Tab-separated table of C-alpha atoms in Angstrom:
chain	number	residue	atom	x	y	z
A	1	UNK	CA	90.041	88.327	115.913
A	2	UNK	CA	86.594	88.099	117.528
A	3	UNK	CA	82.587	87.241	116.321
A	4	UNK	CA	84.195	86.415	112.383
A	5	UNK	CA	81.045	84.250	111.023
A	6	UNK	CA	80.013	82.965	107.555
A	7	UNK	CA	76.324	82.620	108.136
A	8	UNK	CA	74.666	80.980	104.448
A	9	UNK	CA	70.497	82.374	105.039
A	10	UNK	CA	68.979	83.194	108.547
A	11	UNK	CA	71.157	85.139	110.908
A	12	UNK	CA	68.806	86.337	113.895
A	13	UNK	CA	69.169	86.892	117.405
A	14	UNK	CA	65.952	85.546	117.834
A	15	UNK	CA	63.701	84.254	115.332
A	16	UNK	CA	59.957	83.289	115.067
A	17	UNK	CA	59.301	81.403	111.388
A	18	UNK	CA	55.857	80.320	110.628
A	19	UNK	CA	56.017	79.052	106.776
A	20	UNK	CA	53.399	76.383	105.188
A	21	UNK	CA	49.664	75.802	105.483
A	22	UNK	CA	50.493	76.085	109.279
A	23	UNK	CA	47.828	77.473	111.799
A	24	UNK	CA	49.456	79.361	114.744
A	25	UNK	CA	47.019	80.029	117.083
A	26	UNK	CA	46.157	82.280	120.680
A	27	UNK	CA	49.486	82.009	122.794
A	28	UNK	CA	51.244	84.160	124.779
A	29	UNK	CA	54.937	84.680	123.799
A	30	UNK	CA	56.516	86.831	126.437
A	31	UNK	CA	60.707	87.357	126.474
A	32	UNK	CA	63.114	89.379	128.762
A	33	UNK	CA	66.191	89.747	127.133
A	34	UNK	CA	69.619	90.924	128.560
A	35	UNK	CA	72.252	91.019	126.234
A	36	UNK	CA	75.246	93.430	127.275
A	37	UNK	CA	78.615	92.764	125.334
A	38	UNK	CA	82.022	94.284	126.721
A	39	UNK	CA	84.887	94.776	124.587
A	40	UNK	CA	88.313	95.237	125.441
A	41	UNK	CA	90.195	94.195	122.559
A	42	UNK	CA	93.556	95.458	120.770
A	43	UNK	CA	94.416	97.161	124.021
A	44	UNK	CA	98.110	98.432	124.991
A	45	UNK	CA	99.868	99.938	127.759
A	46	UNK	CA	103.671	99.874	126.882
A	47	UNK	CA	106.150	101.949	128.232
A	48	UNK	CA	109.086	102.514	126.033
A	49	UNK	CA	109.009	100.581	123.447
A	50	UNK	CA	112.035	101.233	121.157
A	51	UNK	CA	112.854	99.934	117.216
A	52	UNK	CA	116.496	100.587	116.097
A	53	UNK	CA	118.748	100.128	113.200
A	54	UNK	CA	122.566	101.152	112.423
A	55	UNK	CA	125.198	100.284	110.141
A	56	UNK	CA	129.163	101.800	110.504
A	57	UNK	CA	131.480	101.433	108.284
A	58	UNK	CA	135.812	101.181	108.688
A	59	UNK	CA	138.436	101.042	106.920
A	60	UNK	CA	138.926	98.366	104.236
A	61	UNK	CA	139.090	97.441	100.649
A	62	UNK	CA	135.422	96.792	100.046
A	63	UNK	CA	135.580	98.281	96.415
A	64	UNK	CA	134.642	95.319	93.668
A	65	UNK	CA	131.818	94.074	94.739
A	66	UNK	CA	130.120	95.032	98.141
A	67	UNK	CA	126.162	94.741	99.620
A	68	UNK	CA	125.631	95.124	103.219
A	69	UNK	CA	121.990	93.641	104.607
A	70	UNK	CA	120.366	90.977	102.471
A	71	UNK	CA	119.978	90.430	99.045
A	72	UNK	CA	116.144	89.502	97.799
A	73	UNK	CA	115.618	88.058	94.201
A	74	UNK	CA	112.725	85.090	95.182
A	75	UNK	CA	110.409	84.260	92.050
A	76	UNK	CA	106.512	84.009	93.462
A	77	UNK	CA	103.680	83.298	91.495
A	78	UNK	CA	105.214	82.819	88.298
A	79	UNK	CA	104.411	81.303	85.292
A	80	UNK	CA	105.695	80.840	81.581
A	81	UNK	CA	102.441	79.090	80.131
A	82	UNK	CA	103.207	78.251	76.387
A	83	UNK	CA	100.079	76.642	73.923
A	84	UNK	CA	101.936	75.910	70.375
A	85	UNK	CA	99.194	74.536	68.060
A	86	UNK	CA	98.474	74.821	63.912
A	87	UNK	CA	94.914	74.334	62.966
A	88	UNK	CA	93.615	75.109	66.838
A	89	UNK	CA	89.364	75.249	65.963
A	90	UNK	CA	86.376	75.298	68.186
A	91	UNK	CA	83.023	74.640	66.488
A	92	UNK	CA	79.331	74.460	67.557
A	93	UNK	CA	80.262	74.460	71.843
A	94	UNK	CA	77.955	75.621	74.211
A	95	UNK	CA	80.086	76.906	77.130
A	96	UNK	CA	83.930	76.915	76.941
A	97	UNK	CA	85.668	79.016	78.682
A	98	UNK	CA	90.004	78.870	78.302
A	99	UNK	CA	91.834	80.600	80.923
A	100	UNK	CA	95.845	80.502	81.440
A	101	UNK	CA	95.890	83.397	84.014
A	102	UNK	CA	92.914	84.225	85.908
A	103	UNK	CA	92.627	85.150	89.815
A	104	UNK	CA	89.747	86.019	92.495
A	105	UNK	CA	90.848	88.169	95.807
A	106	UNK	CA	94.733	88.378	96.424
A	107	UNK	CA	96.009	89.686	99.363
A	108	UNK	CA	99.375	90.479	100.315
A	109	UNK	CA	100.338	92.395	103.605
A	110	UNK	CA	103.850	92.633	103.945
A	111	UNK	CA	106.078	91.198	101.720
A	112	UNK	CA	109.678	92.986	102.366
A	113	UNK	CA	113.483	92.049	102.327
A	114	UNK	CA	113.552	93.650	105.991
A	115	UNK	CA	110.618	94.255	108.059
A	116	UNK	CA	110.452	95.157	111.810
A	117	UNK	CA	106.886	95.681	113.282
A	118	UNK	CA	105.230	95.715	116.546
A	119	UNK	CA	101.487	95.280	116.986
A	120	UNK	CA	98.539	93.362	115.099
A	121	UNK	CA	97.972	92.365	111.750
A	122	UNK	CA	95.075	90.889	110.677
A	123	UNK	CA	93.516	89.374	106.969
A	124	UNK	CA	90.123	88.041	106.610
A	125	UNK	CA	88.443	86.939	103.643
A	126	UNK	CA	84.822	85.369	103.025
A	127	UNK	CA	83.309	84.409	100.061
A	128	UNK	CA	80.568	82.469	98.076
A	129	UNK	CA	82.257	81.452	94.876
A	130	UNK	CA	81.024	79.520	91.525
A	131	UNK	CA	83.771	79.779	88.030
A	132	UNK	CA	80.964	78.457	85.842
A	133	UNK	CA	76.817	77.568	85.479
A	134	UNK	CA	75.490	76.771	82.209
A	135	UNK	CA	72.485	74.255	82.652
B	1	UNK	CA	89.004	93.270	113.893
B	2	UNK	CA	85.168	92.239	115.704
B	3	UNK	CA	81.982	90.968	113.907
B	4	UNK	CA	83.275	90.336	111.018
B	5	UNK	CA	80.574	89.122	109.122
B	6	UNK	CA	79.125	87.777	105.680
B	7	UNK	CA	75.337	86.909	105.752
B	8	UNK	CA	73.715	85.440	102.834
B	9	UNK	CA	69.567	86.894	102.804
B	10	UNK	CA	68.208	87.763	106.372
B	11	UNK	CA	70.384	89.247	109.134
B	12	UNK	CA	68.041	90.755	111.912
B	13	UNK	CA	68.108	91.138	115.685
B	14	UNK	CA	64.428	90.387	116.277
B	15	UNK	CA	62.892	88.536	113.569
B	16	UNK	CA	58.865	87.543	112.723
B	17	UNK	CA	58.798	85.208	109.324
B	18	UNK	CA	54.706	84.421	108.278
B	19	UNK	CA	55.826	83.231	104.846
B	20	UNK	CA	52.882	80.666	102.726
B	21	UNK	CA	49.064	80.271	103.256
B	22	UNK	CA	49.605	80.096	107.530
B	23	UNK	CA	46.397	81.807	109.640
B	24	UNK	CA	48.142	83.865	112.519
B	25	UNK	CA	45.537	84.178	115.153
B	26	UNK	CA	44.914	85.851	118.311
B	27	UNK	CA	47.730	86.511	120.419
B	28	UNK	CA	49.733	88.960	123.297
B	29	UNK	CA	53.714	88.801	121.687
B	30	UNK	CA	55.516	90.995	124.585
B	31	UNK	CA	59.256	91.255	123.992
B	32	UNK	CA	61.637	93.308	126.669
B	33	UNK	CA	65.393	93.931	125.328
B	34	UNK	CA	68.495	95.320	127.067
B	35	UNK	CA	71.097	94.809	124.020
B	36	UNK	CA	74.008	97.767	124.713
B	37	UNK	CA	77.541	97.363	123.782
B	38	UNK	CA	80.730	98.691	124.689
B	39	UNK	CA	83.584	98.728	122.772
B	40	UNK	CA	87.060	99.555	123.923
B	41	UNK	CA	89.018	98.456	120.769
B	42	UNK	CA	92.899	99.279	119.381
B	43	UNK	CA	93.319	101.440	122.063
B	44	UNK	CA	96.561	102.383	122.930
B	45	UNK	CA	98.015	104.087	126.188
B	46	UNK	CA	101.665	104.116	125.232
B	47	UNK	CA	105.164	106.236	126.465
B	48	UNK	CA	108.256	106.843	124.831
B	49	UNK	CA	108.053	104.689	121.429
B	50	UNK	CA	110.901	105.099	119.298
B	51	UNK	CA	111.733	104.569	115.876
B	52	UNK	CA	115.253	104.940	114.551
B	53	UNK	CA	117.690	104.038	111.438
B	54	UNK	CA	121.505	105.483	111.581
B	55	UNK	CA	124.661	105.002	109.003
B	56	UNK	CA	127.751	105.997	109.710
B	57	UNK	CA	131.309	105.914	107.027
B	58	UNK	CA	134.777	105.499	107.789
B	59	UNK	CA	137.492	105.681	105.883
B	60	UNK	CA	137.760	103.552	102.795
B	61	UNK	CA	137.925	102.062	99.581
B	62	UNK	CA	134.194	101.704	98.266
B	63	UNK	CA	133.999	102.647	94.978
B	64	UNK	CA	133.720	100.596	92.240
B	65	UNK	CA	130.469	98.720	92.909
B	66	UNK	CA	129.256	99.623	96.447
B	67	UNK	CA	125.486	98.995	98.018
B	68	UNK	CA	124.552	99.532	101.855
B	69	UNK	CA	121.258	98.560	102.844
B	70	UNK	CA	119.417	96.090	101.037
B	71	UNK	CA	119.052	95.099	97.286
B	72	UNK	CA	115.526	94.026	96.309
B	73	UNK	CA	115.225	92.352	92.675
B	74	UNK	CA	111.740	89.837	92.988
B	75	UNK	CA	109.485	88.557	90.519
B	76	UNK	CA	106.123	88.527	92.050
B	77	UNK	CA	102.531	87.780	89.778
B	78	UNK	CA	105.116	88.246	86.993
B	79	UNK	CA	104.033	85.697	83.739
B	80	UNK	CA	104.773	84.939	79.923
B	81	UNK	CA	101.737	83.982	78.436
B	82	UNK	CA	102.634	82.734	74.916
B	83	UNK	CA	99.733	81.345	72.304
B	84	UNK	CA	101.289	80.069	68.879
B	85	UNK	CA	98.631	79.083	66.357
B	86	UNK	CA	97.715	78.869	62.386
B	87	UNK	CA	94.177	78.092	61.513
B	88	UNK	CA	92.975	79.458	64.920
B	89	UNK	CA	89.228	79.361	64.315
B	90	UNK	CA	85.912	79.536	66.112
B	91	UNK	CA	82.357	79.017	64.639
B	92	UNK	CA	78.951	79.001	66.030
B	93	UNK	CA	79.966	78.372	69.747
B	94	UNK	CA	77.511	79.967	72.068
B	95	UNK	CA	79.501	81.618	75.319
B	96	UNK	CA	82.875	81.280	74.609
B	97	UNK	CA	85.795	82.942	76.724
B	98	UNK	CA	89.619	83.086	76.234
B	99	UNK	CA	91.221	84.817	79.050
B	100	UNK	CA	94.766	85.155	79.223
B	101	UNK	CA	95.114	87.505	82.181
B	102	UNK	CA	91.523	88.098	84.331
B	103	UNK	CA	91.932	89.549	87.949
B	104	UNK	CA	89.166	90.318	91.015
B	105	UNK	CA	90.317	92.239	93.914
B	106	UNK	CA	94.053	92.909	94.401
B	107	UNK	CA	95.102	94.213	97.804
B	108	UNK	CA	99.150	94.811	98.643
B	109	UNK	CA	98.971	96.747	101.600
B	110	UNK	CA	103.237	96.725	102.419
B	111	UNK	CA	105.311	95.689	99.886
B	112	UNK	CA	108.397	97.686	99.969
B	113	UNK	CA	112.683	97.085	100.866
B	114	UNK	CA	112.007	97.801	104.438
B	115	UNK	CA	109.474	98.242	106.798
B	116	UNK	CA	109.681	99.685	110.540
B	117	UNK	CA	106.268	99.357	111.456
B	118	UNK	CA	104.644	100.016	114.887
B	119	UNK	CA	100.528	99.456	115.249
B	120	UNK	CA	98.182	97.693	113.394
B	121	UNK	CA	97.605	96.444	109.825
B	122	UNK	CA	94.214	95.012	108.540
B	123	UNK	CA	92.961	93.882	105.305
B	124	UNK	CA	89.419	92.464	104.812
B	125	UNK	CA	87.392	91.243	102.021
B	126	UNK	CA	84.100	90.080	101.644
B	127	UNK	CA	82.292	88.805	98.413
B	128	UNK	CA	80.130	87.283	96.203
B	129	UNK	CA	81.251	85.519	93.149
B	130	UNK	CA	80.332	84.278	89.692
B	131	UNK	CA	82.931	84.093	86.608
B	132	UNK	CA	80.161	82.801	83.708
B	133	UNK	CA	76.558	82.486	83.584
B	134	UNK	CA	75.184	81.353	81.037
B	135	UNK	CA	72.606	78.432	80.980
C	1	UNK	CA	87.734	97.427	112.784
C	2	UNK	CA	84.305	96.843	113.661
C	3	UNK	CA	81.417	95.469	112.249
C	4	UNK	CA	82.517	94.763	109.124
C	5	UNK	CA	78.923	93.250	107.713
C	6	UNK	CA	78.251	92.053	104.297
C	7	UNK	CA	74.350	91.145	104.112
C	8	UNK	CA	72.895	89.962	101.177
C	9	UNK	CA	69.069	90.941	100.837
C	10	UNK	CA	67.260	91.995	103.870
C	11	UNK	CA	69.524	93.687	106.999
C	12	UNK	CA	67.475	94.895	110.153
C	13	UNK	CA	66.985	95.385	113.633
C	14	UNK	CA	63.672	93.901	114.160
C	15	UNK	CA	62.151	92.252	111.082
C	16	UNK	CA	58.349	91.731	110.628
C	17	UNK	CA	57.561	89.753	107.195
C	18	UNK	CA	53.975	88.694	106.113
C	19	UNK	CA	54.306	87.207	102.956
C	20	UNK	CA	51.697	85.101	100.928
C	21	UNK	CA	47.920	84.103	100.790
C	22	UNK	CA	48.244	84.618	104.539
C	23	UNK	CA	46.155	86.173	107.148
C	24	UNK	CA	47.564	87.893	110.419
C	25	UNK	CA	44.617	88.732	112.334
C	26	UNK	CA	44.462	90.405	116.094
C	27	UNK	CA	47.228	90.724	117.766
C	28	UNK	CA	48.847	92.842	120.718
C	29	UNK	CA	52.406	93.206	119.542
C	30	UNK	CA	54.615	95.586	122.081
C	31	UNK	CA	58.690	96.140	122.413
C	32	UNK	CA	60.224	97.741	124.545
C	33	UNK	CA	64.002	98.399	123.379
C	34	UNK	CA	67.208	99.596	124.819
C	35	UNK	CA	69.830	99.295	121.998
C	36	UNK	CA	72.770	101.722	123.408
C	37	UNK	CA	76.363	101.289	121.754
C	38	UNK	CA	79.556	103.208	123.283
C	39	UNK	CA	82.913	103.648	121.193
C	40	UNK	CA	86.078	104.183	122.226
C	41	UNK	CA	88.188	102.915	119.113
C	42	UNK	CA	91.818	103.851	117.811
C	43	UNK	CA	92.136	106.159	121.063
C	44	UNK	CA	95.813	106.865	121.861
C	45	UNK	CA	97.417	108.286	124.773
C	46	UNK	CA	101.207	108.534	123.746
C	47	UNK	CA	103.684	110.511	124.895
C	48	UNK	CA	107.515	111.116	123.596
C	49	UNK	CA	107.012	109.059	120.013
C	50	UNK	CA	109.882	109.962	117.314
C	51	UNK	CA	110.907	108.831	114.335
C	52	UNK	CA	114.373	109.536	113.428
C	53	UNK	CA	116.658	108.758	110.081
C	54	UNK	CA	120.391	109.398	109.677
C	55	UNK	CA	123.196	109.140	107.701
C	56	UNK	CA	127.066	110.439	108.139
C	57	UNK	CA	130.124	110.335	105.933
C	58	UNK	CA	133.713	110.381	106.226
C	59	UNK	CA	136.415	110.563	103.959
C	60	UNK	CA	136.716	108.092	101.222
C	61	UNK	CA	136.557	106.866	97.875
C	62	UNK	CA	133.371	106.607	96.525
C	63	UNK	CA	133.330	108.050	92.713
C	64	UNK	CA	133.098	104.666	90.585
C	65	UNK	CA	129.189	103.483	91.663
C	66	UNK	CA	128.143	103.808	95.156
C	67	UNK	CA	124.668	103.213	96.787
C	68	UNK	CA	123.574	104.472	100.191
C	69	UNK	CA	119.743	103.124	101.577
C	70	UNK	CA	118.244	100.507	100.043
C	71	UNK	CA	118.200	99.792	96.046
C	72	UNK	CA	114.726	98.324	95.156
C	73	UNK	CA	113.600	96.435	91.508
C	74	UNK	CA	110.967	94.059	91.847
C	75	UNK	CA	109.205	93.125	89.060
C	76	UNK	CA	105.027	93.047	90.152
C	77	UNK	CA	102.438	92.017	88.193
C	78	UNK	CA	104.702	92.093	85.054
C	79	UNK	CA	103.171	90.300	82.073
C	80	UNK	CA	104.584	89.888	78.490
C	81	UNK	CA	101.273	88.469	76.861
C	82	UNK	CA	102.062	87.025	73.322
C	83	UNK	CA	99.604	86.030	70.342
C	84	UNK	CA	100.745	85.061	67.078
C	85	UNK	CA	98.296	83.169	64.418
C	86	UNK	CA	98.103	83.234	60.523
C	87	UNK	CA	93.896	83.222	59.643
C	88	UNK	CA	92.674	84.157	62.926
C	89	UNK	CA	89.050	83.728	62.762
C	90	UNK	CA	85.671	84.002	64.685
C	91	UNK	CA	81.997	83.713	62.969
C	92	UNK	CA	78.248	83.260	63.765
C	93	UNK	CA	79.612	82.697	67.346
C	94	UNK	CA	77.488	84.683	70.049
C	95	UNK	CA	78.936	85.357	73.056
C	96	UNK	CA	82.524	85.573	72.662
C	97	UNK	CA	84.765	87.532	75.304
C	98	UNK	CA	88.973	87.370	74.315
C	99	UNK	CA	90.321	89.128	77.651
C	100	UNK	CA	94.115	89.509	77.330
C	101	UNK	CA	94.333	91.607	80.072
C	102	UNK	CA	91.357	92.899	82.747
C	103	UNK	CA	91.213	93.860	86.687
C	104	UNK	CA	88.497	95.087	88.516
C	105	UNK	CA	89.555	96.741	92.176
C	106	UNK	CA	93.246	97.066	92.684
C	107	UNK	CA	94.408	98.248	96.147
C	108	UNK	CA	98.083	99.546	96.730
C	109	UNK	CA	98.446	101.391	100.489
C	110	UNK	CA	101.955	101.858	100.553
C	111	UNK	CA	104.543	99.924	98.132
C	112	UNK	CA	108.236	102.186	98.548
C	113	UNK	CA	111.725	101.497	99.492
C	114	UNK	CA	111.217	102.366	102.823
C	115	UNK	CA	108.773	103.017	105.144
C	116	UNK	CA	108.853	103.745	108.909
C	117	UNK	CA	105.372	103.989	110.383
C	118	UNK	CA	103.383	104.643	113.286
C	119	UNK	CA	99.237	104.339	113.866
C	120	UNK	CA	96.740	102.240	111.889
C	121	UNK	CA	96.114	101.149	107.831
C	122	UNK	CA	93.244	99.794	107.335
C	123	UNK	CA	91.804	98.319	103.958
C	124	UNK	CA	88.399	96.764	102.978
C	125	UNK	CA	86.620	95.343	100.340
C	126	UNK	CA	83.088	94.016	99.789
C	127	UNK	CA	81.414	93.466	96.444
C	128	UNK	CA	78.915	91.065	94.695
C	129	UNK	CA	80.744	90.082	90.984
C	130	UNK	CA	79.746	88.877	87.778
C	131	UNK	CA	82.473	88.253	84.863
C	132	UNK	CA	79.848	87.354	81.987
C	133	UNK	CA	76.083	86.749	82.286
C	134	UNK	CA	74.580	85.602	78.405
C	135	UNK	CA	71.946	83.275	78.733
């Protein structure tokens, strides 16, 4: 990827900031600016480019039992969270908060048993995050 | 992707910032910009791409459990969330959460068996992000 | 993609801010801008692309249970959420949230058993979020 920035206040490309009790007085402030940008990103020239797949079958005893390309059965992400309690009592609190599942962005681009691809994939993620502010 | 960007207040090209009490006085502020851009971007100059999948039989026993191609059985964000309680009680509490399954942005942009897959794939987020407030 | 810009407050080209108890008194303030942008994005020049799926028998047995192409059963985002109290009990309290279950956006492009595919997916998200505010 190209120019990806997490800038917190001020972005400018240029910036004049004048800000307490200040006297700015007579000046001359003169500015030539070139600023050309030339891209040439993500760019292809294939010539044949070719994605195949074939299966053939004979002559057998494949009858009981039979798969043919892979079998997938992962466990992601989870979770069997189990509170047992009897006389379980919040009193008076200001700012409790309890959470057993909780999530901000999730992304997922491919997630396959079989996956051929040719190209560009690309995941970007920015953020400011706070989970709690009670002063 | 290009200029990918998050900016927190200001964002600005040319920027004049005469915040608090400041005496700005006489003055010749001359500014001379060239700023173009050109953007050749996922651009593509391909022949002859192919894409192909073929099955063929012969002659067989298949039948009593067959399966050609593949078998897909995950678990994926996949939970149990079990509360056992009494007396479960709450009084007087200012900003109280329970939260047994809380979600922000969900992308999945391929999830499948199989995937032939020529090109390009992009997933972006950008964000700001509180879960409580409450001072 | 381009430019993908998340900007909090104030977004711009030039920017001219005069805020407080200030003066801004004569001034020659001149600009003299060229600001040209040129796009040539996703541009494709292919020739011959195909996509091509087959399948061919023969003679056999197949009657019992037989599966041709791929057999897909994930489990996603499966939840069995499970409360159980006896005197279940909230009073005087005065911000309370119980969330068993809540999402906010929730992207799928293309979940299947198969996919064969050519060109561009794209897939963006930009937000500013607040669960709970209760001061």
């Amino acid at each position: 990827s190209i120019d990806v920035k997490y800038i917190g206040v001020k972005s400018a490309y240029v910036s004049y900031d004048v800000q307490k009790r200040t006297i700015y007085l007579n000046i001359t402030n003169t500015l030539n600016i070139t600023n050309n940008n030339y891209y040439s990103v993500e760019v292809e020239n294939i010539t044949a480019q070719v994605q195949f797949s074939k299966t053939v079958i004979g002559k057998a005893r494949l009858n009981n039992i039979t798969i043919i390309g892979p079998l997938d059965m992962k466990q992601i992400d989870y979770t069997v969270p189990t509170v047992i309690a009897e006389e379980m009592s919040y009193m008076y609190d200001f700012c409790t908060l309890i959470s057993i599942k909780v999530h901000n962005i999730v992304l997922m681009m491919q997630v396959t048993v079989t996956t051929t691809y040719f190209g560009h994939s690309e995941q970007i993620s920015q953020e400011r995050y706070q989970y709690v502010d009670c002063g």
